[PDB]
Homo-oligomer: A and B are copies of this chain.
Amino acid sequence: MDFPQHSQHVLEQLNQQRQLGLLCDCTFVVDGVHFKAHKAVLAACSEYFKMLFVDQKDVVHLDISNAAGLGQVLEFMYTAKLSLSPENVDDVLAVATFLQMQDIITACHALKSL
């Protein structure tokens, strides 16, 4: 029925839970920056997290170098929006490559085509 409008309302509410740290069940630090998020949302958007969390494994040493790129990727997962620029496109690509998110990988490849 109203599935697109309801799913947007659900994602918006999941985003505000993340901003307030409510019902978050996983935490990362990358470059000294703390992140809070839902394991279920991560698994719904990244195959790396899906394979990691379904295996009942937790995060310790996330193998990424950029916290700014991780913030942009985590922002896309909760808002469906991604702002690419020549200053960040390579860091977003490295994070998305590790997270196996093919949608963001192709998006960065398109940005570098210019």
**A interface, CB within 8 angstroms of B:** 1-11, 13-14, 17, 22-23, 25, 38-41, 43-45, 50, 53-54, 76-77, 79-84, 103, 107
Contacts and interface: CB of A to CB of B under 8 A. Distances in A.
A72 to B, nearest CB: 11
A17 B2 contact: no
User: What does DSSP make chain A's interface, helix, strand, loop or mixed?
Assistant: helix
A46 to B, nearest CB: 10
Number of identical monomers bound together in the oligomeric complex: 2
A23 B10 CA distance: 17
Given A7-B4, A10-B11, A13-B44, A23 B54 contact: yes
Nearest to A38: B40
